[PDB]
Amino acid sequence: TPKGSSLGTPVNLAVLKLSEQGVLDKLKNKWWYDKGECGAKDSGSKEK
Amino acid sequence: LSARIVAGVWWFFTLIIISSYTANLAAFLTVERMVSPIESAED
Predict the structure, then answer these.
(1) Which regions span the lipid bilayer (chain B)?
(2) Nearest to B36 among A41, A42, A48 (CB)
């Protein structure tokens, strides 16, 4: 945001509120995992 | 004539098998098994 703008505080509180609501987690999960290829998520004992 | 080659391929096979079993048993007797009950939250 621009220095000392009137939009700083509201978008700030917005970001916090969205993060707490779970919007950010769900959204990131959406564009990273939900839409994505080879989604096995460590399947067939890949760690061992 | 068939029993000689059958017993030979069989003896050879089980020899490979016991060598593998012993080798791997020593391997597990050494490695300390790398035990990990849980990995990820998905588990």
Answers:
(1) 1-21
(2) A48
